Amino acid sequence: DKVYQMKSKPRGYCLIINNHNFAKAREKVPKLHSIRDRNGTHLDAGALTTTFEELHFEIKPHDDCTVEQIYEILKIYQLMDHSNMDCFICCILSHGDKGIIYGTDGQEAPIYELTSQFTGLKCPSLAGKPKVFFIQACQGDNYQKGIPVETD
Amino acid sequence: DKVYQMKSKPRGYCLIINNHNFAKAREKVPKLHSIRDRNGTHLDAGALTTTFEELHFEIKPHDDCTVEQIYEILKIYQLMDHSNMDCFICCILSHGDKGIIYGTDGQEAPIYELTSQFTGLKCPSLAGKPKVFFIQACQGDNYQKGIPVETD
Amino acid sequence: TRYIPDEADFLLGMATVNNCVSYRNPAEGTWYIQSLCQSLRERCPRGDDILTILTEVNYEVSNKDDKKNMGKQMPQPTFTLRKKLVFPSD
């Protein structure tokens, strides 16, 4: 079985976009008047930092980013030289809705607009290398229902 | 590591929706005036039949289905008793576009509208059991570009 | 009793990522389905799980090309599986 090369030290960058304060969204976007601050999100940021440092990634944290700021950060990493890296990880911790994540300003970033910045053509030094995105956000307002099953 | 139970004989139904003739679409839907018949699709239907019969599934082929006919077929299987089955497979061979597959009539069926007929609530006798959908269709009209990499 | 999500235990094998075409050789079948079937027939007897098999399909279809349009095809599985999925041949 073929396995991606994963030997470089560091393995690559692990970006963490950690959005807590949604004051701007509450003031600016009518429909997000009651969008809440994401209390405890730093516990995820810390867990991701501990975990991926242990796995030999260089952690790059960014707290409380608007959509424009998120795109700026991704553009920086898109243009960076990953030639000595074997992998790239981007973690997004925010509010969201169907197919999107929210900036702290309540603007929407389509998930594809984030991931597609690191295609082979746009980031050639990651060509052939794993690009991993972890998205912690809602993707809508529905409570997924449960179904009864036999216990394992 | 936990593994789904896969011991029943037959394992389950393997539906194959095999759409070849798009005459209706060409006559009825203005934008699909030149949508082509899917010549050779029977070779996929046959390959899937051979493969999944070998793996102990009961094959249920349906050729040249409109969207309404597809929904009728899925409703039949949704209401069927899968209690003695360990798995359900549905294969769709058709034209498509972003997030949808086409009936032979050129009507659109959102992929979620097909898969969501077999949720735990809608098909309780498949609750806790793998439900596998294979969709062979375009998801748009763009030619995916290539990128150069080192040979393995 | 125990409860799990309504949408648990799905595997969706897409022939292509969103926005893009997939290919059908009229004399052989589709790149995706033909690759899928070949990998299932070879690997299921070995006890390999479906995600491993679908990774191989990604690899194989990624090496094919459309020399007319300089096109590629990238299949894409998505899953809410909670356990390993194997299709035993016995």
Next chain:
Amino acid sequence: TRYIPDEADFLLGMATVNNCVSYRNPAEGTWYIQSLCQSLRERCPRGDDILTILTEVNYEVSNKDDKKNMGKQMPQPTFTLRKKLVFPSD
């Protein structure tokens, strides 16, 4: 040289399927990220690949519930990976 698709070699780990909520315990972190990190720390040293680990995350998060709204959460990976992805601890 060899060519592969522009969108190859991606892994997208979603906390939830489309249309639905995911959960954050203000005193512990999110169901998804906390489960992910626990599984990575336990399984990466054993050489387990990321799809196996994410299957475990699906399993673990599927057993959690929101007793206020009778809600569940179903995470959902999607991938164009062409090879096994392991994160060696050494």
